[PDB]
Amino acid sequence: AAQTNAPWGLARISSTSPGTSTYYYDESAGQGSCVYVIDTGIEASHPEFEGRAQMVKTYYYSSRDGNGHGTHCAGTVGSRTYGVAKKTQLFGVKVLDDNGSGQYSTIIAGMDFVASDKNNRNCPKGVVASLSLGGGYSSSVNSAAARLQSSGVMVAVAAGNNNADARNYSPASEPSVCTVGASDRYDRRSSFSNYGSVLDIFGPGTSILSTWIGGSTRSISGTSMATPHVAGLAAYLMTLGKTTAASACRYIADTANKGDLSNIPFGTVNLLAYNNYQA
Numbered sequence: 001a002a003q004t005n006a007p008w009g010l011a012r013i014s015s016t017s018p019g020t021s022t023y024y025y026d027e028s029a030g031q032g033s034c035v036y037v038i039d040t041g042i043e044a045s046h047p048e049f050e051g052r053a054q055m056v057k058t059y060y061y062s063s064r065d066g067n068g069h070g071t072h073c074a075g076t077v078g079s080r081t082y083g084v085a086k087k088t089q090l091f092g093v094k095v096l097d098d099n100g101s102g103q104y105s106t107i108i109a110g111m112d113f114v115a116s117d118k119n120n121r122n123c124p125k126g127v128v129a130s131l132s133l134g135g136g137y138s139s140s141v142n143s144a145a146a147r148l149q150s151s152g153v154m155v156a157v158a159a160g161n162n163n164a165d166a167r168n169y170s171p172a173s174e175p176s177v178c179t180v181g182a183s184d185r186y187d188r189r190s191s192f193s194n195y196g197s198v199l200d201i202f203g204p205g206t207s208i209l210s211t212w213i214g215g216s217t218r219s220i221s222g223t224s225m226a227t228p229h230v231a232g233l234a235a236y237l238m239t240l241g242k243t244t245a246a247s248a249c250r251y252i253a254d255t256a257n258k259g260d261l262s263n264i265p266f267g268t269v270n271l272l273a274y275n276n277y278q279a
């Protein structure tokens with residue numbers, strides 16, 4: 001399938017080179033997979049989600065996304081225009097309040113929720129979790145991310161936006177999950193992207209157009225935006241049968257565009273998520 005004039009990030013993910021605007025993907029499109037977006041929530045009623053999004057959990061007085069951040073991330077995972085996996089099921093878990101903040105304790109509970117909750121969902125092709133959040137190193141946060149992953153969920157997390165080594169951030173520093181740095185449309189490491197040995201992959205993160213609350217759209221930037229590209233890619237690849245929750249991060253690293261990014265610090269992977277789709 002070919003989507004013309006796609007957001008640059010979608011195009012980049014199906015391309016061997018920067019500077020193209022069409023997104024290419026197998027039409028299975030992540031059908032029969034599920035992605036949990038653990039964030040400020042999802043505006044499920046947005047036309048771009050077509051009935052495939054649902055709020056499953058909140059730790060606050062409402063499950064609505066009163067911020068827009070979670071809705072943007074979800075749109076990058078699986079909205080029809082702005083999404084990588086255009087046919088996936090999207091499940092929202094609101095661990096972040098409408099200011100985009102959340103106590104580590106609520107975030108942990110949300111991770112443990114998904115690990116159980118996937119048993120109440122229909123996801124024959126596999127389960128993915130997108131965590132576009134983080135804070136200072138916490139062994140308890142990392143451990144919760146490691147449980148989610150061990151339970152059979154492909155866990156993708158933001159490296160963080162401090163232009164710093166991500167070893168000092170959680171869940172970014174957890175070895176067993178997929179830690180995602182941010183790149184721009186000229187294949188530069190995004191100026192704010194964290195780096196370091198704990199990174200597994202880069203995805204598009206600068207000037208990323210996606211869904212917003214109030215049924216609209218906007219372009220915003222962060223390893224928050226890169227993460228759902230990789231989460232959506234894993235879902236897509238899982239439905240294609242190419243990989244599984246336990247091996248998807250490795251598989252993505254293995255099949256990535258390699259050596260193409262600029263301003264990658266010595267010791268950080270130079271790998272850009274790529275779907276290797278042959279139209």
Ligand SMILES: [Ca+2]
Nearest residue numbers: 174175177179
């Ligand atoms: Ca990692």
